[PDB]
């Protein structure tokens, strides 16, 4: 359902079963009661449902937002376009949040199943979302509780004159 | 109601309102300069009215 490019799971690699033992194993005979006693009745109610969904097949659709002249290009009392950049920059900065959010998801269930070897199979996660937080950081932080678009500018300008300074030096 | 309703409200009360503080800066300048020059309708304070000033021949002559 979801885009696996934008949550990669890596193909599964199950062993086969190989026993060695004459005595059978109770987690297969215990799995096939669980299926028979659970699945089965389970998979039925869902069909069931599903059957009644079909029937009363509706759709919702995504709301897209076009774009918006940002807070640079607008005036110093022009409230009305103020306002304008203000919603497309908190927009923004909700996707920008969701963004890191993905990776972290990422990053965590990469973690978890790695295993013990997690430390070496996760490393372009990891890479992935410190570029991810440093990018998020250097946009937004430190702008405060009464955040903005005019304070991320902010920050934007003094950024560009420090780098401006450095590349001078 | 739809988002876009609560939207063009906001962008019309802010136009509102931020047309209000114009005019009332606006008027905090015009009040100032019209008490300090007097050149305005306000702040006119009276002056003698020279209709009352009269103008037929006196008694001497020289006024």
Redesign the interface.
Known sequence: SWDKDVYPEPPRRTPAPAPQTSLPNPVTYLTKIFDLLVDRPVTLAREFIEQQHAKNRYYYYHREFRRVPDITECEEKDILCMFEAEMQWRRDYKVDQEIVNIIQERLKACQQREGESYRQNCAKELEQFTQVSKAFQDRYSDLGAHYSARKCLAKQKQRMLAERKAAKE | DGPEKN?EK??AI??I??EKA?LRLKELEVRRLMRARGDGPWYQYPTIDKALIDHSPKTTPDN
């Open positions: 939207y906001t962008m802010l136009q309102e931020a114009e």
